[PDB]
């Protein structure tokens, strides 16, 4: 029975994870929860249902309202990870703020079931140096797919890793069409129900950019051998092409419970985690290229990744600041990626490899401040 | 450098295999060829291109025209296999006549790269009992796909095997429409260029039936956990569904050189064997149910397989006889599968495991006579 800490338990991934665990008592047990404090009703229900009071709440006043909270403050999640015996830490926090808990999870020796891609993108080589082989297991569906498909050959036989992208609500739209996009319109993802950040990032295509960096970091494949194809149904979750011309693909109706279940149970599958494809009804899986002129977020992510060092932290931190500005009505939708480009292209000093967490934090601070100057 | 014997070298698969070997002289060497004698100019070219004089030709007269052929007559292919040192025998013969070469190959201890699915369908447990694990490696694209996708879990984690079928030229047709099918129409496959028999069988859906039996025999998955789905593009070659709900699929533009190369090179992939999927232009992969009312060949294959023993030899033999009658204008297209069903339903005695090859041969003889009896009544 694996002991699981769930960071960001009240969120989209976190709540789906608690459901998988609730359905599988003989294999998993919750031993800790962390949240921000914005959803106390959810947190209350989760405390009662799991019987776990080992909980972190970032916001101090929220922690007082809910009562009986052992860790509060901006370091509460990190402290929780440091002070809880666990076999798996499921990091489902949102944003680069997942960085210290990610580093702490790796130091404990526990498996890190990583949903919080921003922590790996920001940490880069610093997070890789803190992990042992196989210690980080991806929850993100593309990387879960890739890990499964890589069982299909030897390392020297892999040609390309191919990520699928839904294309978002604005698939096929012109650059001009993006001008008057509202937060409401950006909020309507075609295939997944998610928190507001991954929703916005999937609309701007920054999510797929983050995922290209995540792919390079997790699997050690060169950027030039990572492809991205737009697949509107989000049924094929990604695929691997081998040197003989064969492709192996992983597929299922979009439901994050499946990759969540596998990250927890790895390498053993979890019976009944999610519905399989049903071929008793006619259907079709479509594929099309991404228009890189309209959506250059992925090319920008490749540029950031190839530069390496703290540049991937810069890419993500510029996004976090610019996205927030869009959500607040201070900038238009195209300015999100426009600001990322501007910040990235001014960031040559950050191509250096981080020695400690503080180097990544510095790079992020620099990027946010510059993005903020672009906004105003 | 693997020494390969290529049976059925002048055919669709055989010619494609020779090209893969030609393109990869560091990996493979042809050391034997077998053919029927119908394509002599092809065989002349192959002898010259490979430098191999170690050749079997089934038709004696044909063998004379080629000249200098060491093995000739109906057992020529089998004798070639028994007397040629090799690492891999690629059996790309067509029909149940591939049975004795398949058994002889297994006995040599060499890998059997099996394109000739009929020999396994006919031999059933007899062929399985002749083989060691990994010794039979499928050239058939569906089974090559399944083999690859099965690397994606442990055996108890497998829920279903899902085979794709092109649907053939008559996909979507009614039973009434099928009555009017000509041999010429049934010779036009949507996705693969093949010899006449697999082309016909893919149009009648008997090919998918044979492949369902082949799946059960190769992988040990029960018939009721083998699905078939119609996929008109033939890009996804087959898929495995696991107990968590995950499906793993193998895909490529249809090109038999890919599964041929893998079967020869197993478990090592052959660089550059075939083109990969390209996503630079918009495309669609479609799936739809098979119309089992109009096309019961797969259901009848399951029935035969479930019955077991010699019943799968009966299924295939009834098809070979009925198929040839349709080609000769002796019956209409729907009567192919109609005769298969009639023969199967009278075949209760053949649901016993074959002890020897002769048991299989007896069941096949019985089945052909029964099919001919049905044919002569039409
Ligand atoms: N949702 C999805 O399907 C997918 C998500 N991902 C990735 O998984 C991660 C989680 O995303 P998602 O579940 O959508 O996010 P949500 O916004 O739904 O959830 C965020 C979680 O983090 C908590 N949180 C927010 N700020 C803080 C803080 N300062 N300290 C501690 N906890 C905090 C929230 O708690 P509260 O709200 O209670 O304050 C909530 O539990 C993201 O990295 C995302 O990119 C990846 C692929 C798919
Ligand atoms: N073609 C394809 O893409 C696929 C084929 N297969 C299977 O592979 C096998 C071969 O199919 P395919 O290549 O299309 O068939 P073809 O009809 O194209 O080739 C048949 C081959 O067998 C030879 N042959 C015929 N009779 C005899 C005999 N009595 N003794 C020795 N050789 C003989 C023929 O020689 P000749 O013509 O010179 O007399 C020819 O070389 C079949 O079992 C088929 O179902 C499976 C999947 C795909
Ligand atoms: O793994 C699942 N997701 O990343 C949800 C977002 C999918 P998209 O970025 O392709 O729209
Ligand atoms: O493996 C390849 N084939 O069997 C070619 C026939 C394809 P079909 O039976 O699905 O039409
Ligand atoms: Mn993802
Ligand atoms: Mn086939």
Short mmCIF file of C-alpha atoms in Angstrom, two decimals, chain A residues 145 148-149 151-154 156-157 162 228-229 236 239 241-253 258 261-262 267-277 279-289, chain B residues 145 148-149 151-154 157 162 227-229 236 239 241-253 258 261-262 267-277 279-289:
data_model
loop_
_atom_site.label_atom_id
_atom_site.label_comp_id
_atom_site.label_asym_id
_atom_site.label_seq_id
_atom_site.Cartn_x
_atom_site.Cartn_y
_atom_site.Cartn_z
CA UNK A 145 1.97 8.25 -23.34
CA UNK A 148 4.43 3.76 -22.39
CA UNK A 149 5.31 3.90 -26.09
CA UNK A 151 8.54 0.26 -24.11
CA UNK A 152 8.26 -0.50 -27.85
CA UNK A 153 11.98 -0.42 -28.66
CA UNK A 154 15.56 0.17 -27.49
CA UNK A 156 19.10 3.64 -30.06
CA UNK A 157 15.99 2.75 -32.09
CA UNK A 162 5.67 13.21 -31.26
CA UNK A 228 4.19 18.58 -32.31
CA UNK A 229 1.04 17.76 -34.25
CA UNK A 236 -3.99 9.92 -29.09
CA UNK A 239 3.52 8.71 -29.96
CA UNK A 241 8.50 7.01 -34.16
CA UNK A 242 11.30 4.45 -34.50
CA UNK A 243 14.17 4.19 -36.98
CA UNK A 244 12.41 1.58 -39.14
CA UNK A 245 9.38 3.78 -39.76
CA UNK A 246 7.14 2.25 -37.10
CA UNK A 247 5.10 4.54 -34.83
CA UNK A 248 3.79 3.41 -31.43
CA UNK A 249 0.95 5.58 -30.04
CA UNK A 250 -1.00 5.65 -26.78
CA UNK A 251 -4.69 6.42 -26.95
CA UNK A 252 -7.79 6.81 -24.77
CA UNK A 253 -10.70 9.22 -24.34
CA UNK A 258 -5.51 7.30 -16.49
CA UNK A 261 -3.26 6.17 -12.01
CA UNK A 262 -0.17 4.99 -13.88
CA UNK A 267 5.14 0.31 -13.41
CA UNK A 268 1.93 -1.63 -12.62
CA UNK A 269 -1.33 -0.52 -14.26
CA UNK A 270 -4.42 0.29 -12.22
CA UNK A 271 -7.42 -1.79 -13.27
CA UNK A 272 -10.48 0.29 -14.22
CA UNK A 273 -8.78 3.69 -13.97
CA UNK A 274 -10.49 5.04 -17.06
CA UNK A 275 -12.64 4.11 -20.04
CA UNK A 276 -10.89 2.63 -23.06
CA UNK A 277 -11.54 3.67 -26.65
CA UNK A 279 -14.71 1.08 -31.55
CA UNK A 280 -18.33 -0.08 -31.63
CA UNK A 281 -19.28 3.42 -32.74
CA UNK A 282 -17.87 5.11 -35.85
CA UNK A 283 -15.33 7.81 -35.11
CA UNK A 284 -12.30 9.56 -36.50
CA UNK A 285 -8.99 10.88 -35.26
CA UNK A 286 -7.80 14.00 -37.03
CA UNK A 287 -4.27 15.38 -37.43
CA UNK A 288 -3.04 18.69 -38.82
CA UNK A 289 0.05 20.90 -38.52
CA UNK B 145 1.69 -4.61 -34.55
CA UNK B 148 5.08 -4.47 -30.68
CA UNK B 149 2.19 -3.08 -28.63
CA UNK B 151 5.74 -4.61 -25.02
CA UNK B 152 3.49 -2.05 -23.25
CA UNK B 153 2.50 -4.17 -20.23
CA UNK B 154 2.56 -7.48 -18.36
CA UNK B 157 -2.56 -6.38 -17.77
CA UNK B 162 -8.00 -5.19 -31.41
CA UNK B 227 -12.00 -7.52 -31.43
CA UNK B 228 -12.03 -6.38 -35.04
CA UNK B 229 -12.61 -2.78 -36.11
CA UNK B 236 -3.18 1.72 -37.56
CA UNK B 239 -3.87 -2.21 -31.04
CA UNK B 241 -6.20 -2.40 -24.82
CA UNK B 242 -4.99 -2.78 -21.21
CA UNK B 243 -6.96 -3.16 -18.00
CA UNK B 244 -6.54 0.47 -16.92
CA UNK B 245 -8.18 1.68 -20.13
CA UNK B 246 -5.00 2.58 -22.01
CA UNK B 247 -4.70 1.50 -25.64
CA UNK B 248 -1.33 1.12 -27.38
CA UNK B 249 -1.35 1.13 -31.17
CA UNK B 250 1.18 0.60 -33.94
CA UNK B 251 0.88 2.73 -37.06
CA UNK B 252 2.51 3.49 -40.38
CA UNK B 253 1.60 4.13 -44.00
CA UNK B 258 8.06 -2.70 -42.33
CA UNK B 261 12.00 -6.14 -41.88
CA UNK B 262 11.08 -6.54 -38.24
CA UNK B 267 13.97 -8.18 -32.07
CA UNK B 268 16.17 -5.53 -33.70
CA UNK B 269 14.58 -2.86 -35.92
CA UNK B 270 15.89 -2.26 -39.44
CA UNK B 271 16.72 1.41 -40.05
CA UNK B 272 14.94 2.92 -43.05
CA UNK B 273 12.66 -0.05 -43.81
CA UNK B 274 9.61 2.08 -44.51
CA UNK B 275 8.24 5.61 -44.32
CA UNK B 276 6.75 6.83 -41.02
CA UNK B 277 3.44 8.63 -40.55
CA UNK B 279 1.72 14.97 -40.13
CA UNK B 280 2.67 17.93 -42.34
CA UNK B 281 -0.69 17.77 -44.10
CA UNK B 282 -4.12 17.30 -42.54
CA UNK B 283 -5.32 13.70 -42.40
CA UNK B 284 -7.88 11.53 -40.67
CA UNK B 285 -7.85 8.00 -39.28
CA UNK B 286 -11.36 6.57 -39.38
CA UNK B 287 -12.88 3.70 -37.43
CA UNK B 288 -16.23 2.00 -37.85
CA UNK B 289 -17.84 -1.28 -36.84
#
